[model samples]
Target: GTWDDIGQGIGRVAYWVGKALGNLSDVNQASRINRKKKH
Candidate 1:
């Protein structure tokens, strides 16, 4: 499904981004922040 790659990509991006932002403790918040920024 096309949504699979899209969702997975989003997850991968969030994981690294969460690590970068030091917010891995709260993955929901981390992914939310990642979705907000341009990087």
Candidate 2:
């Protein structure tokens, strides 16, 4: 049971980190789009 709990905790942390990275990438993409529009 303890091993299962540890695995779950790690999985949650990974999921959160991935989501944050996805958001950052999305913002960067939006900025790129805006730059293209300026031209």
Candidate 3:
């Protein structure tokens, strides 16, 4: 019973986390990528 409950809780948290990340703007996401300079 405990194992099933824990798994369900984890799944719910994962679902919300996925949505949060999905809402990030492209500008914010691009800021996190490495900027390579051309020689």
Candidate that scores best on lDDT = 2
Candidate 2 residue lDDT tens string, 1-39: 686566466668667866887767778899999999996
Per-residue lDDT tens digits for candidate 3, residues 1-39, read: 676566466668667767777866765766666353221
Worst 10 residues of 1 by lDDT: 2-11
Which regions of candidate 2 fall more than 4 Å away from where they truly are? 1-22
Q: Which 10 successive residues of model 2 have the least lDDT summed?
A: 1-10
Q: Give the alpha-carbon lDDT of every model.
A: 0.71, 0.75, 0.64
Who is ahead in lDDT, 1 or 3? 1
lDDT of 1 by residue, 1-39 (tens): 776577466668757766768855588787878988956
The TM-score-based order of candidates, best leading, equals: 2, 1, 3
Candidate 1 regions with alpha-carbon error over 4 angstroms:
1-25
The reply for model 3, stretches above 4 Å from the true place, is: 1-11, 24-39
